[PDB]
Coordinates of C-alpha atoms and ligand atoms in Angstrom, one line a residue:
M1 CA -55.7 -15.5 138.0
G2 CA -59.4 -14.1 137.8
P3 CA -61.6 -14.5 135.7
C4 CA -60.1 -11.8 133.3
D5 CA -56.9 -13.3 133.9
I6 CA -58.1 -17.2 132.5
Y7 CA -60.0 -14.9 129.9
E8 CA -56.1 -13.6 129.2
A9 CA -54.2 -16.3 129.1
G10 CA -56.8 -18.2 126.4
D11 CA -55.6 -15.4 123.9
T12 CA -59.6 -14.0 124.2
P13 CA -59.1 -11.2 126.7
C14 CA -61.7 -9.2 128.4
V15 CA -62.3 -6.1 126.4
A16 CA -64.8 -5.4 129.1
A17 CA -65.4 -6.7 133.1
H18 CA -68.0 -5.4 135.1
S19 CA -68.7 -6.2 139.1
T20 CA -70.4 -4.3 142.0
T21 CA -68.8 -7.8 144.1
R22 CA -65.1 -7.7 142.9
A23 CA -61.9 -7.6 141.0
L24 CA -62.1 -9.8 138.1
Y25 CA -58.4 -9.2 137.8
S26 CA -55.7 -10.3 140.8
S27 CA -54.5 -7.4 140.1
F28 CA -57.1 -4.7 139.7
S29 CA -57.9 -2.7 143.0
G30 CA -59.5 0.3 141.1
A31 CA -62.7 1.6 141.8
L32 CA -65.4 -1.4 140.8
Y33 CA -68.7 1.4 140.9
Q34 CA -69.9 4.4 142.2
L35 CA -72.4 5.1 144.3
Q36 CA -74.5 8.4 145.3
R37 CA -76.1 8.7 148.1
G38 CA -80.0 10.5 148.2
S39 CA -79.2 13.2 151.4
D40 CA -76.5 15.1 149.9
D41 CA -76.8 14.0 146.4
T42 CA -72.4 12.8 146.8
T43 CA -70.7 9.9 145.1
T44 CA -68.1 8.0 146.1
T45 CA -66.2 4.7 144.7
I46 CA -66.0 1.4 146.1
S47 CA -63.1 -0.9 145.6
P48 CA -61.9 -4.1 146.2
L49 CA -60.6 -4.1 149.9
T50 CA -57.6 -6.3 148.4
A51 CA -56.0 -6.4 144.8
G52 CA -58.2 -9.2 142.7
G53 CA -60.2 -9.2 146.3
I54 CA -63.7 -8.4 147.3
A55 CA -65.4 -5.3 147.4
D56 CA -65.6 -3.2 150.2
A57 CA -68.8 -2.9 151.3
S58 CA -68.6 -2.2 154.4
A59 CA -67.4 1.4 153.1
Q60 CA -71.2 1.0 151.1
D61 CA -72.3 0.8 154.5
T62 CA -70.7 4.1 155.9
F63 CA -71.5 6.4 153.1
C64 CA -74.9 5.0 153.0
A65 CA -76.3 5.3 156.5
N66 CA -79.2 7.0 157.2
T67 CA -80.3 7.9 153.3
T68 CA -80.5 5.3 150.0
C69 CA -77.8 5.1 147.4
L70 CA -78.0 4.4 143.9
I71 CA -75.4 1.9 142.1
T72 CA -74.3 5.3 139.0
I73 CA -71.7 3.9 137.7
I74 CA -70.4 -0.2 137.3
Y75 CA -66.2 0.1 136.4
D76 CA -65.0 -1.2 133.7
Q77 CA -62.2 -2.8 135.2
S78 CA -60.4 -4.1 132.1
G79 CA -58.6 -0.7 130.7
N80 CA -60.9 0.2 127.6
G81 CA -62.9 3.0 129.3
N82 CA -66.4 0.6 129.0
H83 CA -68.2 1.7 132.1
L84 CA -72.0 1.0 132.3
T85 CA -74.5 4.5 133.5
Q86 CA -78.2 5.8 133.9
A87 CA -78.9 3.9 130.4
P88 CA -80.4 6.5 127.9
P89 CA -84.7 6.5 125.9
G90 CA -84.0 4.9 122.6
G91 CA -86.9 3.1 120.7
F92 CA -88.2 3.2 124.1
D93 CA -88.4 5.9 126.5
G94 CA -87.6 4.7 130.4
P95 CA -89.6 6.4 133.4
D96 CA -86.9 8.3 134.7
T97 CA -85.5 12.0 133.8
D98 CA -85.8 12.7 130.1
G99 CA -86.6 9.0 129.4
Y100 CA -83.5 7.4 131.1
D101 CA -83.4 4.5 132.2
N102 CA -83.5 4.6 136.8
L103 CA -80.6 3.6 138.5
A104 CA -80.6 0.4 140.8
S105 CA -80.5 0.5 144.9
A106 CA -76.9 -0.9 145.7
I107 CA -78.9 -2.5 148.9
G108 CA -81.4 -5.0 146.6
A109 CA -78.7 -7.6 146.5
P110 CA -76.7 -9.0 149.2
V111 CA -74.3 -11.7 149.0
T112 CA -71.4 -12.9 150.6
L113 CA -68.5 -13.7 149.0
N114 CA -66.6 -16.2 151.3
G115 CA -68.3 -15.4 153.8
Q116 CA -67.6 -11.1 152.7
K117 CA -70.6 -9.0 152.9
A118 CA -71.0 -7.7 149.4
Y119 CA -73.6 -6.4 147.1
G120 CA -75.0 -6.8 143.6
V121 CA -77.0 -5.1 140.7
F122 CA -80.7 -5.1 141.5
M123 CA -82.7 -4.4 138.7
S124 CA -87.1 -3.7 138.9
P125 CA -88.9 -2.9 135.0
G126 CA -87.7 0.4 134.1
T127 CA -83.8 -0.3 135.1
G128 CA -81.3 -0.2 132.9
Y129 CA -77.5 1.2 132.6
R130 CA -76.0 1.3 128.9
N131 CA -72.2 2.0 127.3
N132 CA -72.8 3.6 123.8
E133 CA -69.3 4.6 123.7
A134 CA -67.6 1.1 123.8
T135 CA -63.9 0.2 122.6
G136 CA -62.4 -3.3 121.9
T137 CA -65.5 -5.0 121.5
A138 CA -66.4 -7.3 119.0
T139 CA -68.4 -5.4 115.8
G140 CA -69.7 -7.3 112.6
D141 CA -69.0 -10.7 112.5
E142 CA -66.0 -10.8 114.9
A143 CA -65.8 -13.3 117.5
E144 CA -66.8 -12.4 121.4
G145 CA -67.1 -13.9 124.8
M146 CA -69.4 -13.4 127.8
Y147 CA -70.8 -14.5 131.3
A148 CA -72.3 -12.9 133.7
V149 CA -73.5 -14.0 137.4
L150 CA -76.8 -13.3 137.8
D151 CA -79.7 -14.8 140.0
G152 CA -82.0 -17.2 138.5
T153 CA -85.1 -16.3 140.7
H154 CA -85.1 -12.4 140.1
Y155 CA -86.9 -12.7 136.8
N156 CA -89.8 -12.0 134.7
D157 CA -91.6 -12.4 131.4
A158 CA -90.9 -9.1 129.9
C159 CA -88.0 -7.1 127.6
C160 CA -85.6 -7.3 127.6
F161 CA -82.9 -8.9 131.2
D162 CA -80.0 -8.5 128.7
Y163 CA -76.3 -8.3 129.3
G164 CA -73.6 -8.1 125.8
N165 CA -73.3 -6.3 122.5
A166 CA -76.5 -4.3 121.4
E167 CA -76.5 -0.9 119.4
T168 CA -75.1 2.6 119.8
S169 CA -78.5 4.2 118.9
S170 CA -80.5 2.1 121.2
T171 CA -83.0 1.8 118.6
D172 CA -83.4 -1.5 116.9
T173 CA -81.4 -1.3 113.9
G174 CA -82.8 -5.2 112.7
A175 CA -81.6 -8.9 113.0
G176 CA -78.5 -9.8 113.9
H177 CA -77.3 -6.4 115.6
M178 CA -77.3 -7.5 118.7
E179 CA -75.0 -10.6 121.1
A180 CA -76.0 -10.5 124.7
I181 CA -77.0 -13.1 127.5
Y182 CA -80.9 -12.7 128.3
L183 CA -82.3 -14.5 132.3
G184 CA -86.4 -14.6 132.2
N185 CA -89.4 -16.3 131.0
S186 CA -90.1 -14.6 127.8
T187 CA -92.0 -16.9 125.7
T188 CA -92.6 -13.6 122.7
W189 CA -89.7 -15.8 120.8
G190 CA -87.4 -18.3 122.0
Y191 CA -88.2 -20.3 125.1
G192 CA -86.7 -24.0 126.6
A193 CA -88.0 -26.7 128.7
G194 CA -90.3 -26.6 131.6
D195 CA -91.7 -22.9 133.0
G196 CA -88.3 -21.0 133.0
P197 CA -86.1 -18.7 133.1
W198 CA -84.1 -19.7 130.4
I199 CA -80.9 -18.3 129.6
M200 CA -81.0 -17.2 125.9
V201 CA -79.6 -15.3 123.2
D202 CA -80.9 -11.7 122.3
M203 CA -79.6 -11.4 118.8
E204 CA -82.3 -8.9 118.1
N205 CA -85.9 -9.3 116.6
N206 CA -85.2 -12.7 118.9
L207 CA -84.2 -14.2 122.0
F208 CA -82.7 -18.1 120.7
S209 CA -83.2 -20.9 123.1
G210 CA -81.2 -22.3 120.7
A211 CA -81.2 -23.1 116.3
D212 CA -84.7 -22.6 115.9
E213 CA -86.7 -19.8 116.4
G214 CA -89.8 -20.4 119.1
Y215 CA -89.2 -23.5 121.2
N216 CA -85.4 -25.5 121.9
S217 CA -85.9 -28.2 123.4
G218 CA -82.3 -29.1 124.4
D219 CA -82.4 -25.5 126.9
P220 CA -83.5 -26.0 130.3
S221 CA -85.3 -24.3 132.7
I222 CA -82.5 -23.1 135.3
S223 CA -82.6 -23.6 138.4
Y224 CA -80.3 -21.8 140.6
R225 CA -80.3 -19.2 143.1
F226 CA -76.5 -18.6 141.6
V227 CA -76.5 -18.7 137.5
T228 CA -73.5 -18.2 135.7
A229 CA -74.1 -17.6 132.1
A230 CA -71.7 -18.6 129.7
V231 CA -72.4 -16.8 125.8
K232 CA -70.5 -16.7 122.9
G233 CA -70.1 -15.5 119.1
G234 CA -67.6 -16.2 115.9
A235 CA -68.5 -16.7 112.4
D236 CA -72.1 -18.3 111.7
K237 CA -70.9 -20.0 115.5
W238 CA -72.1 -19.2 118.6
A239 CA -73.2 -21.1 122.1
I240 CA -75.0 -21.0 125.3
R241 CA -73.4 -22.6 128.5
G242 CA -75.1 -22.7 132.3
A243 CA -74.2 -23.1 135.4
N244 CA -75.0 -23.5 139.3
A245 CA -72.7 -20.4 140.9
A246 CA -72.3 -22.3 143.3
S247 CA -71.4 -25.9 142.4
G248 CA -69.8 -27.5 139.9
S249 CA -69.5 -27.0 135.5
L250 CA -70.4 -25.2 133.1
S251 CA -72.8 -27.7 130.7
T252 CA -73.1 -26.4 127.1
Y253 CA -77.1 -25.9 126.8
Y254 CA -76.2 -24.9 122.4
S255 CA -73.6 -24.4 120.6
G256 CA -73.6 -24.4 116.5
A257 CA -75.1 -23.0 113.5
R258 CA -76.7 -19.3 113.4
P259 CA -80.4 -20.1 113.3
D260 CA -81.2 -20.4 109.6
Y261 CA -83.7 -17.1 109.6
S262 CA -82.9 -13.6 107.9
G263 CA -80.3 -11.1 108.7
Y264 CA -78.3 -13.9 111.7
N265 CA -75.5 -14.8 109.3
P266 CA -73.4 -12.8 109.0
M267 CA -74.0 -11.0 112.4
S268 CA -73.9 -7.2 112.4
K269 CA -73.0 -5.8 115.9
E270 CA -71.9 -2.6 117.0
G271 CA -70.1 -3.1 120.2
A272 CA -72.7 -1.0 122.3
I273 CA -73.2 -2.4 125.8
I274 CA -76.8 -3.0 127.9
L275 CA -77.9 -4.7 131.2
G276 CA -81.5 -5.1 131.9
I277 CA -82.7 -3.8 128.9
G278 CA -83.4 -4.3 125.5
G279 CA -81.2 -3.0 122.7
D280 CA -83.6 -0.3 121.9
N281 CA -84.2 0.5 125.1
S282 CA -87.3 -2.2 126.1
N283 CA -87.6 -1.4 129.9
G284 CA -90.1 -3.9 131.1
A285 CA -87.7 -6.9 132.6
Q286 CA -86.4 -7.8 136.5
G287 CA -83.1 -9.6 137.5
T288 CA -79.9 -9.2 139.0
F289 CA -76.0 -8.7 138.2
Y290 CA -72.9 -9.5 140.6
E291 CA -70.5 -9.8 137.7
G292 CA -69.9 -10.8 134.2
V293 CA -67.2 -9.7 131.2
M294 CA -67.2 -8.7 127.5
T295 CA -64.7 -10.7 125.5
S296 CA -62.2 -9.7 122.0
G297 CA -62.5 -13.6 120.7
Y298 CA -64.5 -17.2 120.7
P299 CA -63.0 -18.3 123.8
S300 CA -63.0 -22.1 124.0
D301 CA -64.3 -24.4 126.4
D302 CA -61.2 -24.5 129.5
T303 CA -61.3 -21.0 128.8
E304 CA -64.4 -20.3 130.2
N305 CA -64.7 -23.7 132.6
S306 CA -61.6 -21.8 134.4
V307 CA -64.0 -18.8 134.9
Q308 CA -66.2 -20.7 136.0
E309 CA -64.2 -23.2 138.8
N310 CA -63.1 -19.4 140.1
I311 CA -66.6 -18.8 139.9
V312 CA -67.7 -21.7 142.5
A313 CA -64.7 -20.5 144.1
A314 CA -65.8 -17.2 144.9
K315 CA -68.3 -19.1 146.5
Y316 CA -71.8 -16.8 146.6
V317 CA -74.5 -17.4 149.3
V318 CA -77.6 -15.2 150.1
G319 CA -76.9 -12.3 152.2
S320 CA -79.4 -10.4 155.3
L321 CA -82.0 -8.2 152.9
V322 CA -83.0 -7.7 156.5
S323 CA -81.6 -5.6 159.0
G324 CA -83.0 -3.6 162.5
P325 CA -86.4 -4.8 164.5
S326 CA -87.7 -6.5 162.5
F327 CA -90.8 -8.9 162.5
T328 CA -92.3 -13.1 163.6
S329 CA -93.8 -14.8 161.6
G330 CA -97.8 -14.8 162.9
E331 CA -97.1 -11.2 165.3
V332 CA -100.0 -8.4 165.4
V333 CA -98.4 -5.2 164.7
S334 CA -99.5 -1.2 165.0
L335 CA -96.4 1.1 162.8
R336 CA -96.9 4.6 164.2
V337 CA -95.8 7.9 162.7
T338 CA -92.5 9.3 163.4
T339 CA -92.6 12.7 161.3
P340 CA -93.0 15.4 163.6
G341 CA -96.4 16.9 163.3
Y342 CA -97.9 13.5 162.5
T343 CA -96.6 10.9 165.8
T344 CA -100.0 10.2 166.7
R345 CA -100.8 8.4 163.3
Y346 CA -100.8 4.9 162.2
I347 CA -101.0 2.6 159.0
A348 CA -104.5 1.6 158.7
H349 CA -106.6 1.8 156.0
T350 CA -109.6 2.7 154.5
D351 CA -111.3 -0.5 151.9
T352 CA -107.9 -0.6 149.3
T353 CA -106.0 3.2 150.4
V354 CA -103.3 2.2 152.7
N355 CA -103.5 5.8 155.2
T356 CA -102.5 7.1 157.9
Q357 CA -104.4 7.7 160.8
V358 CA -104.6 8.9 164.3
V359 CA -105.8 6.0 166.4
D360 CA -105.9 6.3 170.4
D361 CA -107.3 3.8 172.8
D362 CA -110.4 5.9 172.0
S363 CA -110.9 5.1 168.0
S364 CA -113.8 2.9 167.1
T365 CA -112.7 -0.9 167.1
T366 CA -113.0 -0.7 163.2
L367 CA -109.8 1.7 163.2
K368 CA -108.0 -0.4 165.7
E369 CA -108.4 -3.4 163.3
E370 CA -107.7 -1.4 160.3
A371 CA -104.1 -0.2 161.7
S372 CA -103.5 -3.4 162.7
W373 CA -101.1 -6.0 160.8
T374 CA -100.0 -9.4 160.7
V375 CA -97.1 -10.0 160.0
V376 CA -96.1 -13.0 157.8
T377 CA -93.4 -15.1 156.4
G378 CA -92.8 -12.5 152.6
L379 CA -94.8 -14.1 150.0
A380 CA -92.0 -13.5 147.5
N381 CA -89.0 -13.7 149.6
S382 CA -88.6 -15.5 153.0
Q383 CA -86.1 -13.4 154.6
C384 CA -88.7 -10.7 153.9
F385 CA -92.6 -10.2 155.6
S386 CA -95.8 -9.5 154.2
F387 CA -98.1 -7.2 155.8
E388 CA -101.4 -8.7 156.4
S389 CA -105.1 -6.5 157.1
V390 CA -106.3 -8.1 160.4
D391 CA -110.4 -6.8 159.6
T392 CA -109.4 -8.6 156.4
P393 CA -107.2 -11.3 156.6
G394 CA -106.1 -13.0 153.6
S395 CA -105.8 -9.2 151.9
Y396 CA -102.1 -7.6 152.8
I397 CA -100.7 -4.5 151.8
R398 CA -98.8 -4.1 148.0
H399 CA -97.8 -1.5 145.7
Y400 CA -99.5 -0.8 142.6
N401 CA -98.3 2.2 140.2
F402 CA -95.8 2.7 143.6
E403 CA -98.9 3.2 145.9
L404 CA -99.5 1.0 148.7
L405 CA -103.0 -0.9 148.6
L406 CA -104.7 -3.0 150.2
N407 CA -105.4 -6.4 148.1
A408 CA -106.2 -10.0 148.6
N409 CA -104.2 -12.7 147.7
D410 CA -104.5 -14.1 144.1
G411 CA -101.4 -16.9 144.1
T412 CA -99.9 -14.9 141.5
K413 CA -95.7 -14.2 141.0
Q414 CA -96.6 -10.5 140.9
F415 CA -99.0 -9.8 143.9
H416 CA -96.3 -12.0 145.8
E417 CA -93.4 -9.4 144.4
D418 CA -95.6 -6.7 144.9
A419 CA -96.8 -7.4 148.5
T420 CA -93.0 -8.4 150.1
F421 CA -90.9 -5.9 152.0
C422 CA -87.5 -6.2 154.2
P423 CA -87.1 -4.4 156.9
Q424 CA -84.6 -2.3 157.3
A425 CA -83.6 -0.4 160.2
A426 CA -85.2 3.0 159.6
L427 CA -83.6 6.1 158.1
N428 CA -84.4 8.2 161.4
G429 CA -83.5 6.1 163.7
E430 CA -86.4 5.0 165.2
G431 CA -88.0 1.6 164.3
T432 CA -87.7 -0.2 161.0
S433 CA -88.2 1.1 157.5
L434 CA -89.9 -1.5 154.9
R435 CA -88.3 -1.6 151.9
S436 CA -89.7 -2.9 148.5
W437 CA -88.5 -6.1 147.5
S438 CA -89.1 -5.4 144.2
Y439 CA -88.4 -2.5 143.9
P440 CA -85.5 -1.4 146.5
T441 CA -85.7 1.6 145.7
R442 CA -88.5 2.7 147.1
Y443 CA -90.2 1.9 150.7
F444 CA -93.5 2.5 152.7
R445 CA -93.8 6.5 152.4
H446 CA -96.1 8.7 154.0
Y447 CA -97.1 11.5 151.6
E448 CA -100.5 14.0 152.3
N449 CA -101.6 10.9 155.4
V450 CA -101.8 8.0 151.6
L451 CA -98.7 5.6 151.4
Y452 CA -96.8 4.8 148.7
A453 CA -93.6 2.6 147.2
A454 CA -91.5 6.5 147.6
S455 CA -88.2 6.6 146.3
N456 CA -85.7 9.7 148.4
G457 CA -86.3 12.0 144.9
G458 CA -87.9 10.9 141.9
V459 CA -90.5 11.3 139.2
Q460 CA -93.8 11.5 141.5
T461 CA -94.7 14.0 143.9
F462 CA -94.8 11.5 146.7
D463 CA -90.5 11.1 145.9
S464 CA -90.4 14.0 147.8
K465 CA -87.0 14.3 149.1
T466 CA -88.8 16.0 151.8
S467 CA -89.0 15.3 155.2
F468 CA -88.7 11.2 153.0
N469 CA -86.2 10.2 156.2
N470 CA -89.0 10.6 158.4
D471 CA -91.6 9.8 155.6
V472 CA -89.6 6.4 155.5
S473 CA -90.0 5.6 159.6
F474 CA -92.6 4.4 161.9
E475 CA -92.2 2.8 165.0
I476 CA -93.4 -1.2 166.2
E477 CA -95.8 -1.1 168.4
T478 CA -98.8 -3.4 170.2
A479 CA -101.4 -4.0 167.9
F480 CA -104.6 -1.8 169.1
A481 CA -106.1 -5.1 168.4
Ligands
LIG1 C1 -93.4 -16.5 133.5 O1 -93.5 -17.4 134.1 C2 -94.0 -16.7 135.2 C3 -94.6 -17.3 136.7 O2 -95.4 -18.8 136.7 C4 -95.8 -16.5 134.3 O3 -96.9 -16.2 135.5 C5 -98.0 -16.5 134.9 O4 -98.9 -15.1 134.3 C6 -99.9 -15.6 134.3 C7 -100.5 -13.9 133.4 O5 -99.5 -13.3 132.8 C8 -101.3 -15.7 135.4 O6 -102.4 -15.3 134.6 C9 -100.2 -16.8 136.6 O7 -101.6 -16.6 138.0 C10 -99.1 -16.6 136.5 N1 -98.4 -17.8 137.4 C11 -98.0 -17.6 138.7 C12 -97.8 -18.5 140.1 O8 -97.8 -16.3 138.9 C13 -96.0 -16.0 133.6 O9 -97.2 -16.3 132.5 C14 -94.9 -16.5 132.7 N2 -95.0 -15.9 131.6 C15 -94.7 -16.8 130.1 C16 -94.7 -16.3 128.7 O10 -94.8 -17.5 130.3
NAG2 C1 -79.2 6.5 161.4 O1 -80.2 4.8 161.1 C2 -79.3 3.8 162.5 C3 -80.5 3.1 162.5 O2 -81.6 2.9 162.6 C4 -79.4 4.4 163.7 O3 -79.1 4.1 165.2 C5 -79.4 6.5 163.8 O4 -80.1 6.6 165.6 C6 -79.5 7.0 162.6 N1 -79.1 8.5 163.3 C7 -80.1 9.6 162.6 C8 -79.0 10.8 162.4 O5 -80.6 9.4 162.1
LX5_3 C1 -85.7 -6.0 119.9 C2 -84.5 -5.2 121.2 O1 -83.7 -4.8 120.5 C3 -84.4 -6.3 121.8 O2 -83.8 -6.7 123.1 C4 -85.7 -7.3 121.4 C5 -85.5 -9.2 121.5 O3 -84.5 -9.5 120.0 C6 -86.0 -6.9 120.1 O4 -87.3 -6.6 119.9 S1 -89.4 -6.6 119.0 O5 -90.1 -5.7 119.6 O6 -88.7 -7.7 118.3 O7 -87.8 -5.6 117.9

């Protein structure tokens, strides 16, 4: 019995069931999600390895070898056709072609489920999925449940990392026109105890941590690396439940009346589905989605408790973000360019500008230090790495407007995320490619001898697909200094 078999048994069946990690029905063996690769722009689907089983991650690794992959579609396993696709422009434009939101990397969110590798949906700011043509989803004041298993440590305070019911126009049509899980440390509207992040409910013109606008004491800060967020809503009732998706039970952080403010009772739900964005296409948020559903009707505590027990038995554990040669903390390296015609150039810097330059045993000591990097434990992720300047200690390679800069560590979360890179076996097979931890669609990429955090295709000039594989591949060499 999968989560959707459990909801079904409670007479509150799934009407949308979305996972890149596993089947949510014991008898589901169809496509979980679709991949598109940058090498030829073709697509494939990933299914469970067994009916009711875990995603075929090895089939993703095969399709995505020596290239980059986007998740184009998260299929609805319920049969309602409620597939999640690239989110369209709305009240806000996204950063992608015609104001669409970015697709997620296929490889930003590696996990194992009971020891078996799978991939979640790692969503950087500007990433979003949507279905504005959804069937069987609750509308008006009709009862619904939902849950998502999310990364409790991947979040920001920008609007809005949501999963659930939103507006079919992708615009703000008012209070009560949304009911979606929120995860992050936004304090623009609601917040809970501590420093966050919180699970809140986006009802539009508000994230609610409970009955009141703003502070509600009973909504705790989330500790867990994997968080089960379970939200439900009916006729002037709604609840927030939270669990460690790896251990134990759901606790109820809110349950009772609609917030007693203009437009939240009755609700005006439109039945659209969003992931990673606000209802109005607010696209500043980040977070990671592994699995989730939306139901018809108001699930009992008992149904959700059984879903949580099943989630625990799926045994979510952090996967490896790193492949290829990789590094040790304290090692000093030079990174050689492998692109034919630039194979004597190394990653260097001129002040804050990270670039490539010819470096050999006759270069000035100045340039030798600028082309030498102390590798340290990743500032935002201890599996990955940060690249510290030899000539400027305490300064690291960080992306900013997708250009690589050498900036001083200012101790902030944002700097740490922008300065964390995950070594990957080079796309051209010569050494390492360095994937952005925070924007895993992007890699260290030289373009006109300057370093960018470039995507394999995209809206920036430095995202050119020409020579991408070569331009993101670097040999790890003894530091000049
Ligand atoms: C959300 O949490 C982050 C991380 O703790 C907060 O980060 C601080 O943000 C301010 C400016 O926004 C910086 O000056 C601090 O240096 C940040 N701290 C760290 C450790 O990075 C952020 O403020 C929180 N947002 C809200 C609304 O509370
Ligand atoms: C593909 O990437 C792997 C890992 O770097 C490497 O062994 C292989 O040689 C590469 N092949 C091509 C065609 O680039
Ligand atoms: C409206 C968006 O669709 C929600 O995600 C967000 C919070 O409820 C709202 O933003 S607004 O700025 O309050 O309109």
